[PDB]
Design a protein around this ligand. Sequence first.
Ligand SMILES: O=S(=O)(O)OC[C@H]1O[C@@H](O)[C@H](O)[C@@H](O)[C@H]1O
Ligand SMILES: O=S(=O)(O)OC[C@H]1O[C@@H](O)[C@H](O)[C@@H](O)[C@H]1O
Ligand SMILES: [Ca+2]
Ligand SMILES: [Ca+2]
Lengths: 479, 479
Amino acid sequence: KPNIVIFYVDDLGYGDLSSYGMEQAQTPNIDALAAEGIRFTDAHSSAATSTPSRYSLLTGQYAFRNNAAILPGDAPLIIDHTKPTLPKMLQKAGYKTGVVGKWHLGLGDGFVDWNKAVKPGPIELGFDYSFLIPATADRVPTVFLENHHVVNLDPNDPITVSYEKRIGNRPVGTEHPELLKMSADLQHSNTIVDGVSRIGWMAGGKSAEWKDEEFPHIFTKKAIDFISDNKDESFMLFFPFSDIHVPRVPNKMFAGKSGMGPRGDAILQMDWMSGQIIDELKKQGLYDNTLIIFSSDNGPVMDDGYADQAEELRGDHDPAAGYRGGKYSAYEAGTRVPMIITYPKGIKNNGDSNALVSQIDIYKSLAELAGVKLDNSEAIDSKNMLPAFLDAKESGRTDMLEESFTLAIRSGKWKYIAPFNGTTPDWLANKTAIENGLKTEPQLFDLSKDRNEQHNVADKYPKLVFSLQAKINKIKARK
Amino acid sequence: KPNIVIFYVDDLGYGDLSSYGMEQAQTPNIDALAAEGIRFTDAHSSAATSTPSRYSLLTGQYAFRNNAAILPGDAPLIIDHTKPTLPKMLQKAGYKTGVVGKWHLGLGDGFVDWNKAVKPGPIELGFDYSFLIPATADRVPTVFLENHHVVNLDPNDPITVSYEKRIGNRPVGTEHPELLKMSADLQHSNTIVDGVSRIGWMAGGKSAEWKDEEFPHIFTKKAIDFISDNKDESFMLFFPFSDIHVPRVPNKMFAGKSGMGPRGDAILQMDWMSGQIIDELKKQGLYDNTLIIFSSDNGPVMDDGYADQAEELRGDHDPAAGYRGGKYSAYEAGTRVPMIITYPKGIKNNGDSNALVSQIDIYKSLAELAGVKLDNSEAIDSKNMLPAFLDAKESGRTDMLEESFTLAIRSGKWKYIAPFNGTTPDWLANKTAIENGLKTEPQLFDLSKDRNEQHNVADKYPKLVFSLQAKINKIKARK
Ligand SMILES: O=S(=O)(O)OC[C@H]1O[C@@H](O)[C@H](O)[C@@H](O)[C@H]1O
Ligand SMILES: O=S(=O)(O)OC[C@H]1O[C@@H](O)[C@H](O)[C@@H](O)[C@H]1O
Ligand SMILES: [Ca+2]
Ligand SMILES: [Ca+2]
């Protein structure tokens, strides 16, 4: 039974790898995986934002089924811990499980006292070991959580977090721009730590504050500690990167080296972080009997809140590589992300694969790998794609959901986006460089003639529109 | 029968890899090789300069036995095309052979007419295909030699080359500093090509003129085509980089990216080119039955002829990694260079290896691997080291010669340098930033206690000094 490692990059776009087209900088370590293994060209995150994609990846359930949406850093755990989870399925098969990186699935069951035992958390979800950034890099609280406790927390300088009003004695970005390494939009202009303002306020916790620049070393180290401690048994590591999420404050090992600014330097950081872990697996002789899944939680974004020159220094770079949309979108670039799989022992055919695969398929696929029988209720929306994960010649799905602020479905070459008639959060206004694809009219595209989704042919094909819409409706009605 | 790829870097120091301690730049493709295979810490080129090390590589025979030393671009071939070579030996075992990169071994047998079929050359030494820089990048002729003919030669505009006198209409660096990308010493201030002045003068051949900045594309493209043409037979690629020899004119992809200027930038270019070919083997499915040898032709130099900010932008980087000497030197860093070997289908044990081994042993090791018996008189100074090469727990040599302007020998922990009572090139006086170990006294070091050869114990060990000189004497006298 192989080891499992899931490299999970924050906001990595389809074209954000040199093995997926990037010319202005290279990602040699990740590029090496694609050369050896299977490079997926029609693989998808379950959603176009973070919290819902992670929810599906770990539960095998569509995010809308529990209304999963981008969370604050003090939100309660959105996964019901009394139910099967992907890591839980693996412990069953005898795996040691661990997660090192950004969480963003919630913590606790109502009110998080950051100075006491924090639970339910990952450990209650079937992870033997955890070391987390609570939410995202740009949200408070601004600390690491190891298993059930905040790291380097001092009793006499206790932590409190607010998303309602300003608390504590830390400067805030709006009032002290001279303390800011980069300027930030109003949503991101609250409590300053390590010269960067964040979303929300945090009081206390000086001993426990993180230093963004120190991430690549902190997180690779904990990972390697986990691989070391558990090398004598079957282990699974979930490594959700904070990179390349804002704020991009890359390490000086990378800063200014991509020629694309902090966004590009962050891609570089990710690729070096990946390499440290892969190479350790190589040195310790674990690599050949390890299945590595490398992917992303959603599509790319340039300016996501900070004045980090992403647009000014982008040049010719296209982080979606010719697909319409990006982060937050129902268009292909919202969910169509790099996925690369390596497993020397088990891959029958290396090469590029265009199997229609969604990250929600990982659940049942690993189950088959681990030899675990699933309940009829466990991972209901998941499908076994293990053949297509190990053979670039196998096909994957017939049809596939993509979740955004609306819902969209792929059925072969067809791309349908259901009409949206709700309201969207105020911060979405900031992201208009990206076409979100939310219209009150139906949209239908043939990606085989129209890869970029520029020609809506729903008036040409009402037969098809009605069909695919009922499919989305029927999916929502699955009981 | 495994394929064989030899990556052979120019002037690569023991510490010019982050897998060997380099901190100011990252060499991920080469470090990935190190992590998977065996990383050698006591591995040596035969000599502390280019031509002789290359000579002992292909002949399995010490350089002094033919007075082999750094050659001008118009020197006749110094390897006897009538006698066996490493490529010829491989041809006996069925391999399709090729060399892409620099040569520096000489061409022809006296007068080279560059506008006609150049023979003898690499082809008569058992190479099926060759694409070459005839000498060094800082040496005329600045053209490519493909098999027996100059690439993109226009017969109306014939090439002539001289190292004695100025010929032709091209400007020289001594008259036109305004035309240069960087300033040079007077040795390197002759003919200007692509905005860099060379050693010696070249008339004619405008269409053949290469461009340093395109070297990575041109040469990785000829290597990959060589592979992709012979993916179906057993083959061997000798891939002698011009990186990182002076002039350092890195492609814009790497310019300014290392922090250490052109010298470090050439290291990044080296690594990118390695990954291009590594990734090719992996994509075509060849990697697992391919043995890769990665090493260097001699130790490191900072300033070697051009003003390229090597020293200024060094920081705290030590290319000799604490070893004494370097390029041209009789001290350890003159020959002790990085060496790495992978061969997924053959490596017994991976890891780090302190086997005392030399590049002269690659001949007889490969002849075991290819199963070819050698004459009593073939590769006579070569020894089979295949077990140390493929098993990180295996040891190597009892003794080992090191060649420079004097002779030295390693004898386990012992290092002895034979006194030097001779004369040296005026240009070596441009190289005094490095200690060359040329002394009229004998030198003895216990590398066990004195890694950086600081304490000459010739006085404390008169009998040992006699024994090791004696062996050097006996080694010269081998008929
Ligand atoms: O990948 S995500 O965690 O979904 O990104 C979360 C996003 O939420 C938005 O409200 C912020 O303006 C963004 O700056 C970003 O933090
Ligand atoms: O790497 S080597 O080919 O050994 O170096 C040859 C050297 O010859 C010397 O005359 C020059 O001053 C150096 O610039 C360098 O070209
Ligand atoms: Ca995300
Ligand atoms: Ca050299």
